[PDB]
A = this chain, B = another copy of it.
Amino acid sequence: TLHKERRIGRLSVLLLLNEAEESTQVEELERDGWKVCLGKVGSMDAHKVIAAIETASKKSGVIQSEGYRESHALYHATMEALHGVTRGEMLLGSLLRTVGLRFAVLRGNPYESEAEGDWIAVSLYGTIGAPIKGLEHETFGVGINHI
C-alpha cells in the first residue's frame, strides 16, 4: 500500500515540473528522508542520457558508487523512463530526433510497510524533436524500481 504522503513517483514529477522552487523543494524532500538528484541533459544519443543520469545519481549519493546491485536498479528504472520519452523505439539520433531533458532521481520507501525498503524513481521531462530548435514538443518518462 502506497503511503499517500510518500508517492515517490508523483513527488519526483512535481519536483521536475516546478521551476520557481529548486533548492526549496529538494531540502524539504531530503528532510523527509528522500535522497534527491537533479540534472539536465540534451543529446541525440540515449547512452549519454543514461550516462548523465547514472553519473549525477552516484555523485549526489542517490545510489552507491560501488557494486552492481544499485547501479542495476538505476539502469532499469532509466530504461523504463526512456520508454515514455521514446514511445516505441528507444532511439533518438538514429531516427533523426533529439531530446532536451530535465531529470530527477528519488530514493526511499514509498510504502506504509517499512519492510518494503528502498525504491527509486527516474523522471524525465523536456522536449523531443528534429535537429532544429522550435520543431519539437514535450515528452515525459517515469521509471520505478526496487533497490
Contact = CB atoms under 8 A, between A and B. Distances in A.
The oligomer's copy count stands at 6
A94 B96 contact: no
Interface string A79-101: 11011111111110111100000
Contact of A46 (B8, B94, B121): B94
Interface residues of A, number: 67
Nearest to A48: B96
A59 interface: no
B134 A138 contact: no
Contact of A9 (B130, B138, B144): B138
Contacts of A113: 67
A116 interface: yes
Chain A facing B: main interface SS: mixed
Given A50-B95, A96-B50, A116-B67, A133 B1 contact: yes
28 contacts: A1-B133, A2-B127, A7-B138, A9-B138, A9-B140, A14-B17, A46-B91, A46-B94, A47-B93, A51-B96, A68-B129, A71-B130, A71-B135, A72-B129, A72-B137, A75-B96, A75-B130, A79-B88, A79-B89, A80-B87, A80-B88, A83-B83, A84-B87, A87-B143, A90-B94, A123-B140, A137-B144, A140-B140
